[PDB]
Design a protein around this ligand. Structure first.
Ligand SMILES: O=C(O)[C@H]1O[C@H](O)[C@H](O)[C@@H](O)[C@@H]1O
Ligand SMILES: [Mg+2]
Ligand code: NA
Length: 397
């Protein structure tokens, strides 16, 4: 039995949007920070610098303006940074209009999201599982190696810019990666051991998404008030945490994020807390290991993470064969967060059980399950683009 998002920690019921926004939301944010993801130690750091390193106005055969931007997290050239790739549809900026944006992290490098040979090859560590990796270094053969998750031309043709950053710029995805990450620079001080409530990879990845948004606020080609933050699987766990913590994100998409993302932990199905923390000990706070094989003691569940997006539109989606993510657990988290969305006048999926494949259900809180295995497909994207067209805040008053 799940904790009620609309009952505060002290037992008092949440009846109105102000109490939600100003009392219950901070309560839940601090529970997720302390017990699951670890504390985000600071939001925007002072002295962030944005350097456009390349700009091409006729990329993708004229369809897009492509920019590469180094986003450095302090003023000294020696502060850590991340490399942002942005494609903006020329049809939109040719009209003297700013484009809305889809923003998400990639798994294996910016050069993998499209074959475009002008994208800078990542100079960072790449995991062995990356396609066409050579001793954890990017190669020309990895270009476009993850393009199936990134239908850039369709996204642009529908009027959206595409922004992305390699998650490994922020925390390399390997158990020792926090030692060479934003986390190791952004405090800890003279200690070697990670604190119990210290953030892990998911928290650092989510922070980078918010830093990317900081950059989009200064870019005159895009409308940073109309940013849909999305991610697949482990990067969808980050996209949910980023969209929950940072209410500037206008729209949030979780593509099969599973355990510690959209899936209920207290439903014991597929991946469990013990399994995710054992295999990926750097992803969550050390404090999350308290709940290994003890999910009943969790003071929150992931439906309350989804509810932290409200009233902003949120899309949670599953794959039919993706038992590990627990599609039903993801759907039931949507249903358990729906009462918060309803508080703000929005509607969630119709019914109490998982919809049929390729039949999305819900208003501003939407769910679909698609056929096939874990992944992010053109079908997923088709549904996300329809959702953005409908619910991504307008450019008008
Ligand atoms: O990111 C992915 O592809 C997935 O990788 C692993 O399977 C992990 O157990 C999942 O939690 C994760 O979602
Ligand atoms: Mg599970
Ligand atoms: Na902008």
């Amino acid at each position: 039995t799940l904790p009620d998002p609309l009952v505060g920690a002290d037992g008092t019921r949440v009846h109105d949007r102000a109490t939600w926004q100003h009392r219950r939301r901070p309560e839940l944010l601090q529970l997720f920070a302390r017990e699951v993801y670890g504390r985000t130690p600071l939001g925007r750091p002072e002295g962030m610098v944005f350097k456009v390193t390349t700009m091409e106005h006729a990329a993708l055969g004229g369809a897009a303006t492509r920019k590469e931007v180094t986003v450095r997290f302090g003023r000294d050239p020696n502060a850590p940074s991340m490399q942002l790739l942005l494609y903006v549809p020329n049809a939109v900026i040719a009209r003297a209009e700013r484009a809305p944006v889809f923003l998400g992290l990639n798994f294996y490098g910016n050069h993998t999201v499209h074959t475009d040979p002008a994208i800078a090859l990542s100079a960072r560590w790449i995991p062995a599982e990356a396609p066409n990796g050579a001793n954890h270094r990017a190669t020309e053969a990895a270009r476009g190696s993850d393009a199936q998750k990134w239908p850039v031309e369709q996204i642009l043709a529908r009027g959206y810019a595409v922004a992305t950053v390699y998650c490994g710029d922020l925390c390399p995805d390997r158990p020792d990666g926090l030692n060479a990450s934003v986390a190791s620079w952004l405090d800890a001080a003279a200690g070697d051991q990670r604190a119990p409530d210290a953030w892990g990879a998911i928290g650092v990845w989510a922070w980078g998404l918010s830093r990317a948004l900081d950059y989009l606020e200064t870019d005159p080609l895009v409308d940073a008030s109309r940013v849909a933050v999305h991610g697949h699987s482990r990067l969808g766990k980050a996209a949910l945490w980023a969209g929950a913590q940072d209410d500037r994100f206008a729209l949030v998409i979780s593509n099969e994020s599973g355990c510690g993302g959209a899936a209920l932990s207290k439903r014991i199905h597929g991946e469990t807390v013990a399994r995710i923390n054992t295999v990926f000990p750097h992803w969550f706070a050390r404090n999350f290991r308290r709940y290994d094989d003890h999910e009943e003691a969790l003071p929150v569940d992931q439906h309350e993470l989804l509810a932290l997006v409200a009233p902003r539109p949120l899309y949670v989606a599953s794959a039919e064969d993706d038992d590990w993510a627990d599609p039903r657990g993801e759907f039931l988290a949507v249903k358990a967060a729906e009462p918060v969305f309803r508080l703000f006048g929005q509607t969630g999926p119709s019914g109490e059980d998982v919809p049929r494949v390729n039949e999305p259900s819900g208003g501003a809180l939407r769910y679909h399950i698609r056929p096939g295995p874990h992944g992010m497909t053109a079908q997923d994207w088709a549904f996300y683009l329809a959702f953005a067209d409908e619910w991504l805040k307008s450019a008008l008053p």
